[PDB]
Amino acid sequence: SGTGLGEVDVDTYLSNLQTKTTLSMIADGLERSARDFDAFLEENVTLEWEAQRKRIYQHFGIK
Amino acid sequence: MTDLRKLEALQALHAELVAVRQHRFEGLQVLETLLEEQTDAFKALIAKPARDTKDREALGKEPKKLKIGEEEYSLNEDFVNDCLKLADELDLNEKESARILIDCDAEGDVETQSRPLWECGVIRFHQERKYLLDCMRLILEIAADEDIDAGLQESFGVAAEDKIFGIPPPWERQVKKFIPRCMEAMKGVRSMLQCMADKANARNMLDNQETLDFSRLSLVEQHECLASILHAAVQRHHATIADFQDFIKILRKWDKYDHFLIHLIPVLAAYITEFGSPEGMGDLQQARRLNDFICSWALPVLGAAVRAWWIAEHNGFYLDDTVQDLRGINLDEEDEQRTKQFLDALKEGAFDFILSVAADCKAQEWQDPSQLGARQWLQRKIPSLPSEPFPFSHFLQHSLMVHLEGFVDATISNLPDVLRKLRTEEDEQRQLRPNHEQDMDLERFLIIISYAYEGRPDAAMSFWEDPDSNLAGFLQWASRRASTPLVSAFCEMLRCLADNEECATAAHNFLLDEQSLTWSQIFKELEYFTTKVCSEIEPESALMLECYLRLIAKLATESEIARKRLIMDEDFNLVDTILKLSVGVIPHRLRACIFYVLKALMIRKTHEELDAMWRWVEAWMTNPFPGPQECMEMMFREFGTGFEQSNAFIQLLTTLLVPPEGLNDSVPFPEWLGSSIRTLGIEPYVDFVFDVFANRTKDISDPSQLRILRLSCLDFVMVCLVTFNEDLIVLGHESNISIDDAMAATNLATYVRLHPFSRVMEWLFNEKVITSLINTIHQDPISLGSASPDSPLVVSILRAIQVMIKALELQETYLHLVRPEVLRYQGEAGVRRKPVANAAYSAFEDGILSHLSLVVDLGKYCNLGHAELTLACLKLLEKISTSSRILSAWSPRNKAIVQLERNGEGETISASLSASIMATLDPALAASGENYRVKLAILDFLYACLRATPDQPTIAHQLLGFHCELSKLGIEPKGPFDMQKSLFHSLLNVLITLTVSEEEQGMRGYLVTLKYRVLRILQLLWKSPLSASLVMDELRATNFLFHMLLREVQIQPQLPWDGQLVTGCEFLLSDASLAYIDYLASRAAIFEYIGKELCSVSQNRIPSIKRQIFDALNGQIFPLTIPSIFDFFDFINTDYKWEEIPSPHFTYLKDLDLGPCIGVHYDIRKAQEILALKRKEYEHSQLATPEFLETVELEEKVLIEWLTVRNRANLLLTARLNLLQAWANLLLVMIESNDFKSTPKMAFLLQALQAILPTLEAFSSLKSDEAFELARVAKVLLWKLEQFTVGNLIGDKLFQLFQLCLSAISQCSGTPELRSLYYSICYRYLTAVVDTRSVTNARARTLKAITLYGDRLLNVICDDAYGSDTTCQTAAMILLNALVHTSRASVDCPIIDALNRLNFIGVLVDSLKEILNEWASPSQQYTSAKLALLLQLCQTRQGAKYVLQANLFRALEQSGVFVVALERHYALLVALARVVGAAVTARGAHNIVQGRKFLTQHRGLVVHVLKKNAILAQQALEERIEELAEAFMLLITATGFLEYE
């Protein structure tokens, strides 16, 4: 068989390839930014007062 | 081949002999090698072994296995029957018949002819002898050629002496002579022909008639060849008296008169010339005995002619008494005896028989109507030929004419007194009894002389060189007072003795006075007859007048002094006499002769001659002795009766329309033609011609006359149409009245009003004309098949097709710039014209769209072989298919598809087209090869038919072998296209078997054009979705791309194009640019097809062809190797500098720009007119106009080239671009659709990177068209990513590529798309490669490279951000984040300071307002990246100061921002809270006040988030809520709100 079976055309094939590459780039950038932010927060919070920062509020505010 | 059979060997030998005969000695060694293999064949002329009974019994007993020489074959019940039938038909031995039939079966001629095997065997047996004798004939002919080298002339002679005559050469040496063998062969041929005729008459008294006719033709040709061989042998003095007596006896026993006697007469003529005349064995003792023996006969005229010839040739001895002995012999007695014998021979009809033979020899199927009834007014009593198709050759006619002129010379130089006494006796007889008609001996003899001296000026000059010789003496003596027949014969002789101009001038000077005949008496008799007719006429007077007219016409056509003298002679007044004679009551023959005389006189003329001719015509047509309007039409109707006078008048008109300058202004006729009388000028003539051609074509019974009349009418129409200026009228209507003055407008108006083109078109718009045309073109195929290439039918059809083409071309010009002007002129002035056009037929296609058999006839006429006719039919069909109204009427079901499917016309048309395109071409005659021209015409027709209306099927789909159905196609079972035998498969075959790589020249031009046209047709068929699936299926099932790649050729700057190098400056001006563009387009199409097929095969998940494709691409075939795709990337080279061009100085014409010249196409005429106007103004200024003129001229000669160069260059550029694009696309299809491992292909990736590195370095900022194509593939392959070296190379290449991207970004080159590609390339490099001494070194080097550019690049990055484009802004926003991250990775940072100095932070924070309006979607990701970048800055200690000075607290308040939609909202809130917390906690206790204010103004909202935290979408929402709570808690604990309470 052949000549077309749930297939696409080259003009649309290249467009789909470019769209997929762009989406993958955006997703990778977002994931890297999120990971960098998480690492920064972990480095800044691991110094001290890990649970006290929330305990003070749980004691002040309504539990 | 080399192992050729008898038939093929003889055919090759005949071809080589014919080639050598045409001055081509490229086969001398081939002939020397062939003549040695067929020695046994040339030994015996023809000999068939007698039918043996032993072989018959052996074949009939065990017809199982046969052994012939060294080969063995198996016999079956059918082959044995065929052998027996052949042996019984030809009485041939069983072994020879079996061998012939085995040869026929091996060669496979049964399918080529589709005939029984025995008929093919008989045909081969006849062809054997045919070629075996034709070879000997050509050999003996070349052996006597005087226009060749003496060495070869003697070599062929000795070869013929050794092989044919079996006489060994002088350097060496029971057997039988050659004459008896030839005589026995001819006798056997005669007996075989007689037996064949008897058996055919018995059996007939079928499908074999044509075979019998061809066999008879071959037999008569073999007999003629044997006769010529015998004549040559006799001329070589290899005869005796025994053979002479035998031949004389055979002649005496002749029964019937046929072509055999006409073929044998040269034999006896040469015999008598050798033995009779003193030009050989001049033995007087034997001569007397031969005379007594010759002087029983079954036909007395033969004996009379033989005796007359013998006497004429024997008189050479009784001339003098010094060269021989004549003692003891009487003279007067023998003289009287010979005289009485010659008189008896004459009375018996010798000259009559000679004349009848001479006439029947040159019997032509068609004759020129200018010589009707000439030399056909005698009393012939000899029985005529049976009219069977036995045409003669050329050598036989030459020999016959030579013998006749020799006999004439002998009779004139030996028997003058005989002719004198004969003439005196005839005169006395005519005088003593005028009522009776004496014999025509002298007239017949003069006519025979005329026939002999025809087309032979070398011999005709003999009658003029020596005016005191025997020939000139008799010529001058035969011009004295005589009767009408003798004068007519002398005039006909003079006419036929004017084959050239010198002989015509000699005859003119000899006829005029310097008694004999003179022009004075001729004109006196003409005037006498004119006065007698005008105040009956006998046939003799009419014949004399016709002869005089023919002679005058011939002299005027051949000579020039006579044409210039008689035309303006005051004492003769030839024109006046012929005009007074024509207006009288006389047959049409005299009028036709007068018209032909006028044509001859007007074949070359000047302005004064034309003026005088028109004056005389008007004077004699206005009052021919009733108003002029009536007399003119009466004379027209009188001259229209018949065909001879009508055709002659049409030819005269056609000749008069030719200008004196030859084949633009000064229409070839006086502008004041008919100004005196109220007439339209020349229109009446064309009107009469057209109405005669339309209505009076039914009264012509003779088909030849009808064809000639139609051809004359078509030639007249073509001469009238070709004399019309098209571009002139266009330029006039464009700029004459709109720009130029109104002075010349009158000239163009008069030209358009007086030129008959308008009336010709008006008549062409009539139904009678197109009906007559389609009837003439509609003829049976047998006529065209049996006709000759120069037949009048083919010429008439060609002229009709040309007229149709010209009409289809000029119909628009007529309807636009002719019809309205003529209508306005008729409305303004007073003109009375009769319309002859159909208003309903708005165009020329309306009147012909109702004929469906036209296309059928045009297609059937393609199997004739005529190059011109085939090209004309193809062009006509192309123009028809290109029209719109015809295809709208056909397909408004359809009428064309059903018309070609009546009796299988489409199948035979496709078969003929396939056989034609498969025919090889002549390498030497590339541009002149008719086969190549037909191929190109067919390809252009197919291209034009497929390009127009591709969605709906057309005739091209049917011709290709498809079942044209309504809005659907298909293939039929067992059809031509299903069995891989059709036009499409033929094109595929001829393409895959085409090699362009040559050595002598290399990269030919016309093969490139052929393959380019084929690929264009293939692309048109592919792009059409209605004919795409089946085409791809048929292509992939035969490995088309594999054959194409095998036929590919690498391109390099060393290989020249047609012997010309590319670097040469003339390359841009030469034609090699066309071939280069065609090759580029071919490569582009091949790459596109390969990519499409690869994508299809990959998306179908079948490894059957995937691995094959990859193997073919890598360079291996399962092994044959081929260059990989990377090898074909050699067309990208900037060394040629196609973009750069050296601009000359151009000291003048510099201000002349190309504004109005300009799809880059600079017209040359737009600048030509400007420079012409400037030169005219410069000349009018009168300031050194003559000197500097030359300067300007050469300047033009430069700029023209310049213009063309640019055009060419432009083309090349775009061509390259196209190819590149295709290549790029292909490469993409090679990267994505590739499941093979990555580590093995890494070498190919590095090779591609190395190849593109210089391409990008050369086009980094030059052009923004190829940069996108070369950067998108780089971006793609960058995401698809011993080992130490590979990693180092990859890193080095990436670092090198990272430089040009930043360079182009800082230079702000290309469009936002190319900049986005560069941004992505740099982002994937600064994010993955850099992210450990090597790492630190790479980071420092990248930071240094970035600082090298500095703020110059950040400025552009910020400018292109938050702009018009949607993707470029996001790409720049992400690249900024990547850059700041990589910089912080290396407590301060220069990137943040640079961004702050450029006022970017300010606008970035200001844009934060109205974020809710902006917030998968592009705007969402853009805002996300923006907030991420803003948050990244709040982490550094230095950035806190700037983020605080930006005053974002008041900006985030104006926006009023404070399961998937909720998730996105919470993500935005988390981003904002993170930004705020980072900005507050970065600096320290200086921002806590703003944090407290924000927490107090937005209290409560954060409480809900902090209390909420205290399937996939749910988990994502919970994670976002947790992140928001953590961010708010961090902000609180950093601000210190607890202390505030």
Swiss-Prot record, chain A:
Compartments where located: Nucleus, Nuclear pore complex; Nucleus membrane
Subunit structure: Component of the nuclear pore complex (NPC). NPC constitutes the exclusive means of nucleocytoplasmic transport. NPCs allow the passive diffusion of ions and small molecules and the active, nuclear transport receptor-mediated bidirectional transport of macromolecules such as proteins, RNAs, ribonucleoparticles (RNPs), and ribosomal subunits across the nuclear envelope. Due to its 8-fold rotational symmetry, all subunits are present with 8 copies or multiples thereof. Part of a tetrameric NUP192-NUP170-NIC96-NUP53 or NUP188-NUP170-NIC96-NUP53 module.
Family note: Belongs to the nucleoporin interacting component (NIC) family.
Function as written in the Swiss-Prot or TrEMBL entry: Functions as a component of the nuclear pore complex (NPC). NPC components, collectively referred to as nucleoporins (NUPs), can play the role of both NPC structural components and of docking or interaction partners for transiently associated nuclear transport factors. NIC96, which is localized to the core of the NPC and the distal ring of the nuclear basket, is required for de novo assembly of NPCs.
Protein's name according to its UniProt entry: Nucleoporin NIC96
Gene: NIC96
Section of the entire sequence shown: 240 to 301 of 1112
Curated annotation (Swiss-Prot), chain B:
Function field: Functions as a component of the nuclear pore complex (NPC). NPC components, collectively referred to as nucleoporins (NUPs), can play the role of both NPC structural components and of docking or interaction partners for transiently associated nuclear transport factors. NUP192 is located to the NPC core at the nuclear membrane and is essential for de novo assembly of NPCs.
Cysteine pairings via disulfide bonds: none
Domain of life assignment: Eukaryota
Family designation: Belongs to the NUP186/NUP192/NUP205 family.
Assembly description: Component of the nuclear pore complex (NPC). NPC constitutes the exclusive means of nucleocytoplasmic transport. NPCs allow the passive diffusion of ions and small molecules and the active, nuclear transport receptor-mediated bidirectional transport of macromolecules such as proteins, RNAs, ribonucleoparticles (RNPs), and ribosomal subunits across the nuclear envelope. Due to its 8-fold rotational symmetry, all subunits are present with 8 copies or multiples thereof. Part of a tetrameric NUP192-NUP170-NIC96-NUP53 module.
Keywords, sorted A to Z: mRNA transport, Nuclear pore complex, Nucleus, Protein transport, Translocation, Transport
Protein name: Nucleoporin NUP192
One GO molecular-function entry: structural constituent of nuclear pore
InterPro entries in alphabetical order: Nup186/Nup192/Nup205
Locations listed in the record: Nucleus, Nuclear pore complex
PANTHER family, A to Z: NUCLEAR PORE COMPLEX PROTEIN NUP205
Any one Gene Ontology BP term: protein transport
